Amino acid sequence: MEAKAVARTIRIAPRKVRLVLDLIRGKNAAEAIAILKLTNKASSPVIEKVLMSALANAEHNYDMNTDELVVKEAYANEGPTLKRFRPRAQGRASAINKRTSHITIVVSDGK
Template sequence: MEARAIAKHIRISPRKVKIVIDLIRGKNLGEALNILSLTPKAASEPVAKLLRSAAANAENNYDMNVDSLYVAEIQANQGPTLKRFRARAQGRGTQILKRTSHISVVLKERE
């Protein structure tokens, strides 16, 4: 049995999120949450929130034991990019890309 959670349109670049999720892939749920609480990256807060949501889904929807859960799969894909312009010299403008992420996690029970 597996429990899933997906967070869409997170306003952090997927490249920055992947640095954080690589730290917790394959770890137990409690250990992953501890790692995220001590990680000084902006992406650690939404990833921790997503892990807690997946754990709640596992407990309430599938009657899984929260103490035996581990991060089976976690990935960060690119979401829609917001295109903005910033003023530059001599009346020109330069495009600024504000990237977003879709983060998905799958928790499974250890045998």
């Protein structure tokens, strides 16, 4: 049985978010929580909140036992991009992409 949670339009670049997701994909929930708490990257607290929300609805909506759950899926899709500019020398402007991520966590009991 599976439970899902999504954080949509997090203002962090998907490349960056996926660096951290690659660490927790497929691990036990408690180990993943520890990894996120002790990994020093900007997306760790956000990913942690997605994971805790998924575990919470595993417990509440599906009465799953949270101590048997594994991170079955973890991934970041691209959200809409905020388009910005930076003034450069000699009157020119250059684009700045403030990218966003949709972060999905799926936890599973394997049954």
